[PDB]
Amino acid sequence: MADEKPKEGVKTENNDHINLKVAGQDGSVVQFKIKRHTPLSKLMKAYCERQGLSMRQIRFRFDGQPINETDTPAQLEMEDEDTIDVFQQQTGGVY
């Protein structure tokens, strides 16, 4: 005989997901989908690696401000499907 039972209409171990880009000004891009607390640096390390560059040689921005190694889609107050920007730097050389 069948071992059947109805299951209760709650699912407490869910979380929220959000879709973020990381985009360079060479038009180079990665789509990601992360939980609303997941750190943005995990996305920005992987971008920087597939480009081959040192994370040191680059700045990052969103909605008018910098991103830190700990900012989250909660911390920045982000709505879904947005873009993070990446940027180069130009110190040294002949003055």
């Binding site: 891009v29 990665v30 789509q31 989908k33 997941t38």
Partner: peptide, 13 residues
């Protein structure tokens, strides 16, 4: 084709 990476941040044995 590979412009896609999937990421979360809680881990344990």
């Amino acid at each position: 084709e590979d412009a896609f990476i999937v990421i979360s941040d809680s881990d344990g044995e």
